[PDB]
Write a protein that holds these residues in place. Structure first.
Motif, PDB file in Angstrom:
ATOM      1  N   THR A  29      19.447  17.369   2.523  1.00 19.17           N
ATOM      2  CA  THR A  29      18.909  18.156   1.381  1.00 19.17           C
ATOM      3  C   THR A  29      17.616  17.515   0.865  1.00 19.17           C
ATOM      4  OG1 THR A  29      21.124  18.829   0.780  1.00 19.17           O
ATOM      5  CG2 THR A  29      19.419  19.113  -0.904  1.00 19.17           C
ATOM      6  N   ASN A  30      16.631  18.342   0.487  1.00 17.22           N
ATOM      7  CA  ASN A  30      15.325  17.885  -0.070  1.00 17.22           C
ATOM      8  C   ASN A  30      15.552  16.931  -1.256  1.00 17.22           C
ATOM      9  OD1 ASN A  30      12.374  17.984  -0.531  1.00 17.22           O
ATOM     10  ND2 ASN A  30      12.987  19.184  -2.333  1.00 17.22           N
ATOM     11  N   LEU A  31      14.801  15.830  -1.345  1.00 24.80           N
ATOM     12  CA  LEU A  31      14.771  14.966  -2.577  1.00 24.80           C
ATOM     13  C   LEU A  31      13.434  15.111  -3.336  1.00 24.80           C
ATOM     14  CD1 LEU A  31      16.508  11.843  -1.046  1.00 24.80           C
ATOM     15  CD2 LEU A  31      17.489  13.277  -2.829  1.00 24.80           C
ATOM     16  N   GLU A  32      12.415  15.731  -2.736  1.00 33.37           N
ATOM     17  CA  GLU A  32      11.133  16.103  -3.396  1.00 33.37           C
ATOM     18  C   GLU A  32      10.271  14.857  -3.578  1.00 33.37           C
ATOM     19  OE1 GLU A  32      10.023  19.104  -3.406  1.00 33.37           O
ATOM     20  OE2 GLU A  32       8.160  18.625  -4.490  1.00 33.37           O
ATOM     21  N   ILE A  33      10.662  13.725  -2.979  1.00 35.34           N
ATOM     22  CA  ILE A  33       9.857  12.471  -2.969  1.00 35.34           C
ATOM     23  C   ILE A  33       9.154  12.410  -1.624  1.00 35.34           C
ATOM     24  CG2 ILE A  33       9.925   9.936  -3.006  1.00 35.34           C
ATOM     25  CD1 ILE A  33      10.577  11.005  -5.647  1.00 35.34           C
ATOM     26  N   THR A  34       7.842  12.227  -1.611  1.00 33.05           N
ATOM     27  CA  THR A  34       7.089  11.821  -0.404  1.00 33.05           C
ATOM     28  C   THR A  34       6.637  10.375  -0.626  1.00 33.05           C
ATOM     29  OG1 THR A  34       6.700  14.018   0.377  1.00 33.05           O
ATOM     30  CG2 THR A  34       5.078  12.400   1.085  1.00 33.05           C
ATOM     31  N   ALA A  53       2.987  18.238  -3.265  1.00 34.63           N
ATOM     32  CA  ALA A  53       1.562  17.853  -3.190  1.00 34.63           C
ATOM     33  C   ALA A  53       0.967  18.155  -1.801  1.00 34.63           C
ATOM     34  CB  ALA A  53       1.437  16.396  -3.537  1.00 34.63           C
ATOM     35  N   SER A  54       1.819  18.276  -0.768  1.00 30.59           N
ATOM     36  CA  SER A  54       1.481  18.508   0.665  1.00 30.59           C
ATOM     37  C   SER A  54       0.444  17.504   1.166  1.00 30.59           C
ATOM     38  CB  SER A  54       1.037  19.919   0.911  1.00 30.59           C
ATOM     39  OG  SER A  54       2.008  20.815   0.397  1.00 30.59           O
ATOM     40  N   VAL A  55       0.809  16.223   1.133  1.00 30.77           N
ATOM     41  CA  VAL A  55      -0.069  15.121   1.625  1.00 30.77           C
ATOM     42  C   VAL A  55      -0.465  15.394   3.090  1.00 30.77           C
ATOM     43  CG1 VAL A  55      -0.100  12.666   2.196  1.00 30.77           C
ATOM     44  CG2 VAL A  55       0.823  13.408  -0.015  1.00 30.77           C
ATOM     45  N   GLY A  56      -1.755  15.290   3.426  1.00 31.41           N
ATOM     46  CA  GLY A  56      -2.256  15.425   4.806  1.00 31.41           C
ATOM     47  C   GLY A  56      -2.635  14.072   5.390  1.00 31.41           C
ATOM     48  N   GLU A  57      -3.584  14.063   6.336  1.00 34.29           N
ATOM     49  CA  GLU A  57      -4.137  12.871   7.038  1.00 34.29           C
ATOM     50  C   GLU A  57      -5.124  12.098   6.151  1.00 34.29           C
ATOM     51  OE1 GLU A  57      -2.665  12.736   9.815  1.00 34.29           O
ATOM     52  OE2 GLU A  57      -3.507  14.082  11.363  1.00 34.29           O
ATOM     53  N   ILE A  58      -5.784  12.823   5.251  1.00 35.58           N
ATOM     54  CA  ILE A  58      -6.819  12.313   4.305  1.00 35.58           C
ATOM     55  C   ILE A  58      -6.359  12.676   2.895  1.00 35.58           C
ATOM     56  CG2 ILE A  58      -9.285  12.397   3.703  1.00 35.58           C
ATOM     57  CD1 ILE A  58      -9.926  12.929   6.546  1.00 35.58           C
ATOM     58  N   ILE A  59      -6.463  11.735   1.957  1.00 35.39           N
ATOM     59  CA  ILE A  59      -6.141  11.992   0.518  1.00 35.39           C
ATOM     60  C   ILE A  59      -7.284  11.386  -0.298  1.00 35.39           C
ATOM     61  CG2 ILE A  59      -4.757   9.889   0.175  1.00 35.39           C
ATOM     62  CD1 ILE A  59      -2.781  11.761  -1.404  1.00 35.39           C
ATOM     63  N   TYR A  60      -7.476  11.851  -1.541  1.00 35.40           N
ATOM     64  CA  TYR A  60      -8.428  11.210  -2.492  1.00 35.40           C
ATOM     65  C   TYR A  60      -7.595  10.387  -3.471  1.00 35.40           C
ATOM     66  CZ  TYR A  60     -12.940  12.795  -0.736  1.00 35.40           C
ATOM     67  OH  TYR A  60     -14.023  12.998   0.065  1.00 35.40           O
ATOM     68  N   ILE A  61      -7.964   9.118  -3.619  1.00 34.97           N
ATOM     69  CA  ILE A  61      -7.316   8.113  -4.508  1.00 34.97           C
ATOM     70  C   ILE A  61      -8.421   7.578  -5.419  1.00 34.97           C
ATOM     71  CG2 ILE A  61      -6.163   5.859  -4.525  1.00 34.97           C
ATOM     72  CD1 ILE A  61      -4.365   8.098  -3.357  1.00 34.97           C
ATOM     73  N   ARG A  90       0.873  -1.206   0.000  1.00 32.61           N
ATOM     74  CA  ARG A  90       0.000   0.000   0.000  1.00 32.61           C
ATOM     75  C   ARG A  90       0.896   1.237   0.000  1.00 32.61           C
ATOM     76  NH1 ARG A  90      -2.915  -1.317   5.188  1.00 32.61           N
ATOM     77  NH2 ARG A  90      -1.027  -2.607   5.244  1.00 32.61           N
ATOM     78  N   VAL A  91       2.095   1.111  -0.538  1.00 32.45           N
ATOM     79  CA  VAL A  91       3.099   2.201  -0.509  1.00 32.45           C
ATOM     80  C   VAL A  91       3.211   2.812  -1.913  1.00 32.45           C
ATOM     81  CG1 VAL A  91       5.542   2.715  -0.086  1.00 32.45           C
ATOM     82  CG2 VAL A  91       4.262   1.188   1.445  1.00 32.45           C
ATOM     83  N   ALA A  92       3.087   4.136  -1.969  1.00 35.39           N
ATOM     84  CA  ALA A  92       3.070   4.958  -3.201  1.00 35.39           C
ATOM     85  C   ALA A  92       3.993   6.151  -2.975  1.00 35.39           C
ATOM     86  CB  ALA A  92       1.652   5.371  -3.525  1.00 35.39           C
ATOM     87  N   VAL A  93       4.307   6.856  -4.061  1.00 32.49           N
ATOM     88  CA  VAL A  93       5.164   8.068  -4.096  1.00 32.49           C
ATOM     89  C   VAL A  93       4.423   9.195  -4.822  1.00 32.49           C
ATOM     90  CG1 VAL A  93       7.476   7.094  -3.845  1.00 32.49           C
ATOM     91  CG2 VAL A  93       6.417   7.128  -6.124  1.00 32.49           C
ATOM     92  N   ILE A  94       4.794  10.420  -4.496  1.00 33.91           N
ATOM     93  CA  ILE A  94       4.115  11.669  -4.944  1.00 33.91           C
ATOM     94  C   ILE A  94       5.124  12.770  -4.676  1.00 33.91           C
ATOM     95  CG2 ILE A  94       2.972  12.154  -2.732  1.00 33.91           C
ATOM     96  CD1 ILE A  94       0.548  13.116  -4.245  1.00 33.91           C
ATOM     97  N   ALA A 121       8.581  12.641   3.808  1.00 31.02           N
ATOM     98  CA  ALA A 121       9.253  13.489   2.806  1.00 31.02           C
ATOM     99  C   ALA A 121      10.749  13.181   2.870  1.00 31.02           C
ATOM    100  CB  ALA A 121       8.954  14.943   3.089  1.00 31.02           C
ATOM    101  N   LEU A 122      11.309  12.627   1.806  1.00 28.71           N
ATOM    102  CA  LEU A 122      12.695  12.118   1.842  1.00 28.71           C
ATOM    103  C   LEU A 122      13.659  13.300   1.744  1.00 28.71           C
ATOM    104  CD1 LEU A 122      12.732   8.882  -0.330  1.00 28.71           C
ATOM    105  CD2 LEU A 122      12.159   9.192   2.060  1.00 28.71           C
ATOM    106  N   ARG A 123      14.784  13.185   2.451  1.00 32.77           N
ATOM    107  CA  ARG A 123      15.982  14.054   2.309  1.00 32.77           C
ATOM    108  C   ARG A 123      17.198  13.128   2.221  1.00 32.77           C
ATOM    109  NH1 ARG A 123      14.008  19.096   3.562  1.00 32.77           N
ATOM    110  NH2 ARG A 123      16.119  19.976   3.678  1.00 32.77           N
ATOM    111  N   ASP A 124      18.283  13.542   1.565  1.00 34.38           N
ATOM    112  CA  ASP A 124      19.527  12.730   1.543  1.00 34.38           C
ATOM    113  C   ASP A 124      20.228  12.913   2.896  1.00 34.38           C
ATOM    114  OD1 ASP A 124      20.697  15.176   1.335  1.00 34.38           O
ATOM    115  OD2 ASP A 124      21.610  14.828  -0.633  1.00 34.38           O
ATOM    116  N   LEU A 125      21.442  12.388   3.049  1.00 32.13           N
ATOM    117  CA  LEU A 125      22.141  12.375   4.362  1.00 32.13           C
ATOM    118  C   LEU A 125      22.794  13.744   4.614  1.00 32.13           C
ATOM    119  CD1 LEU A 125      23.576   8.738   4.384  1.00 32.13           C
ATOM    120  CD2 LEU A 125      21.467   9.645   5.385  1.00 32.13           C
ATOM    121  N   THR A 126      23.050  14.521   3.552  1.00 38.11           N
ATOM    122  CA  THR A 126      23.449  15.955   3.628  1.00 38.11           C
ATOM    123  C   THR A 126      22.270  16.786   4.157  1.00 38.11           C
ATOM    124  OG1 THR A 126      22.760  17.133   1.663  1.00 38.11           O
ATOM    125  CG2 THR A 126      24.442  15.441   1.334  1.00 38.11           C
TER     126      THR A 126
END
Length: 182
Positions: free
Chosen positions: A69-74, A42-50, A34-38, A62-67
């Motif tokens: 820094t933003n990776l822009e993947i949620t 998109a600013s995902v909250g507690e409720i989303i429409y799918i 049940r794992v997806a990326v966006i 929200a992923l960041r690298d070890l430096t």
């Protein structure tokens, strides 16, 4: 039309859903269970429409690298009654350049859209909407609003998701195997 679009179409038909937040409708790639990326914007909250179904969000990261820094993947985990086909074996293990890529989008506005974006460069650093961002892929297509979340594929690999552009070029956040180890 050819083997590139064949692979692209195979991913879109089984591993995408239409994600709607308060920031609009997004192409959302389902990776496994049940794992997806966006894109993080998109600013995902507690409720989303799918696919226009009200869905509780069990987790969002929200992923960041070890430096740091933003990776822009949620990475989102969805309270959904169905699993995605496991496509983690299509994900690259390392950062790379790629020769022939297709960008595929499915929203209300842009259903069944496939773009031959050509050669993909390992760009690296991009100031994306004012945010320093790492692990960016660049292709020379004039991509437009409505395309974010779009899946970037080569034959046999899912290499990134569309996160922005400057009118001449489009930019994708890399997807890597190590993001989805369980």
């Amino acid at each position: 039309m050819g083997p590139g679009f064949d692979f692209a179409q195979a991913i879109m038909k089984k591993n995408t859903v239409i994600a709607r937040t308060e920031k609009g409708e997004f192409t959302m790639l389902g990776v496994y269970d049940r794992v997806a990326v966006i894109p993080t914007h998109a600013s995902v909250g507690e409720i989303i429409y799918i696919n226009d179904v009200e869905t509780r969000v069990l987790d969002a990261c929200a992923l960041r690298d070890l430096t740091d820094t933003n990776l822009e993947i949620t990475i989102v985990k969805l309270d959904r009654n169905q699993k995605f086909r496991d496509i983690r074996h299509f994900l690259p293990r390392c950062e790379d350049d790629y020769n022939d890529a297709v960008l595929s989008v499915h929203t209300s506005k842009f259903p069944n859209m496939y773009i031959p974006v050509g050669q993909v460069t390992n760009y690296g650093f991009l100031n994306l909407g004012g945010t320093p961002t790492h692990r960016i892929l660049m292709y020379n297509f004039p991509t437009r609003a409505g395309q974010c979340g779009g899946v970037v594929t080569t034959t046999g690999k899912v290499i990134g998701i569309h996160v922005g552009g400057n009118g001449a070029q489009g930019f994708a956040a890399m997807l890597l195997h190590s993001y989805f180890t369980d």
